[PDB]
């Protein structure tokens, strides 16, 4: 089997992407944030504290003839950005882009933190990291991909995120029309439960490539590119007036600037992030200070190849017995 679904930016900055997901019988379609940095499929629901729901579409398990309470199971997750959610668990039929999994754990939120409530466009998350990170207790649950894997034509999914435009998540096949040149595959460590890999270096604009190993994670659920402070300083030093602002929470730059590209290495291959992808616009409406899309990972504890990086590439998440990651230009 295969599946193919379009993913759409939630706003004009590409802060996140939503993908329609069918849950239950008859189908209830919710728009979920596909997150290769976590492993829980959770949704706003009829059980979510009413004051914490503001415009989201909810899953109502009592209206699904295939929903079953997973008795005694609870979940609770905290994300890197400080957001969180928790609740109980149903199993139900879940379909993405025509690919159907029966008996998928659907984690129903009883509580969500303010960041989730405030984002009316995101109805929940669909985790695509390794199932070892799943938070359901006392019986850990599998991700949608893990459950689908054996049925898929090939045990892979691909992320093809758009820059200020829709893109595609495919399951079970590689669309050879969706990228240019060849796909370069690179080793993955699953030791921390992430799609963790080692970039071979970087360049700023038309500058020379610096060969250096940068361990990090491919994370579709993180907006920006978070890299070591040395790398980030070298980038922003090429933008007149750019500076790190503790009050704003990162590097800012004059909105009048033209940003240089940023290149990262994948083996001997190179992925080029155009400068425009690094512009996250005014820090507040009407400001002439703009927020940068490359930020320091210092104090995160891990480097994160988030959407800024991933949307410059066609990315293969290869879930074969020995997983790997592939990157192609597009």
In the residue annotation, 199 being an active-site residue is answered as yes
Decide if 207 contacts 40 (C-beta within 8 A).
no
DSSP state, residue 123: -
76 is written with which tokens?
């609770």
Q: Which of 39, 64, 85, 199 is catalytic?
A: 199
Which secondary structure element, helix H or strand E, spans residue 127, and what is its range?
A: strand 124-127
Q: Which of 14, 33, 35, 119 is catalytic?
A: 35
As separate numbers, helices (DSSP H) first and strands (DSSP E) second, the chain gives: 4, 24
Number of other residues whose CB lies within 10 A of the CB of residue 262 = 29
In the residue annotation, 35 being an active-site residue is answered as yes
Decide if 3 contacts 96 (C-beta within 8 A).
yes
Q: How far apart are CA 54 and CA 251, in angstroms?
A: 31
Nearest to 220 by CA among 96, 9, 36: 36
DSSP state, residue 189: B
Active site residues: 35, 199
């Amino acid at each position: 089997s295969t599946g193919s679904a379009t993913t759409t930016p939630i706003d004009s900055l590409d802060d996140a992407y939503i993908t329609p997901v069918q849950i239950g019988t008859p189908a209830q379609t919710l728009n979920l944030d596909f997150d290769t940095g976590s492993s829980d499929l959770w949704v706003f629901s009829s059980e979510t504290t009413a004051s914490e729901v503001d415009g989201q579409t909810i899953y109502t398990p009592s209206k699904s003839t295939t929903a079953k309470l997973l008795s005694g199971a609870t979940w609770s997750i905290s994300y890197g950005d400080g957001s969180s959610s928790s609740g109980d668990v149903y199993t139900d039929t879940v379909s993405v882009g025509g690919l159907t999994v029966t008996g998928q754990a659907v984690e129903s939120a009883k509580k969500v933190s303010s960041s989730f409530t405030e984002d009316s466009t995101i109805d929940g998350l669909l985790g695509l990291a390794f199932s070892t990170l799943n938070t359901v207790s006392p019986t850990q649950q599998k991700t949608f991909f893990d459950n689908a894997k054996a049925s898929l034509d090939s045990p892979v999914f691909t992320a093809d995120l758009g820059y200020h435009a829709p893109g595609t998540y495919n399951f079970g096949f590689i669309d050879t029309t969706a990228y240019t040149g060849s796909i370069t595959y690179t080793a993955v460590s699953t030791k921390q439960g992430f799609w963790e890999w080692t970039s071979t270096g970087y360049a700023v604009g038309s500058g020379t490539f610096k060969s250096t190993s940068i361990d990090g994670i491919a994370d579709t659920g993180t907006t920006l590119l978070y890299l070591p402070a040395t790398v980030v300083s070298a980038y922003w030093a090429q933008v007149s007036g750019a500076k790190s602002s503790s009050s704003v929470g990162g590097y800012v730059f004059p909105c009048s600037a033209t940003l240089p590209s940023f290149t990262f290495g994948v083996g001997s291959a190179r992925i080029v992030i155009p400068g425009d992808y690094i512009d996250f616009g005014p820090i507040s409406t009407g400001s002439s200070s703009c927020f940068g899309g490359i930020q320091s990972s210092a104090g995160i504890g891990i480097n994160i190849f988030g959407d800024v990086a991933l949307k410059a590439a066609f990315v293969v998440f290869n879930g074969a017995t020995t997983p790997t990651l592939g990157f192609a230009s597009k």
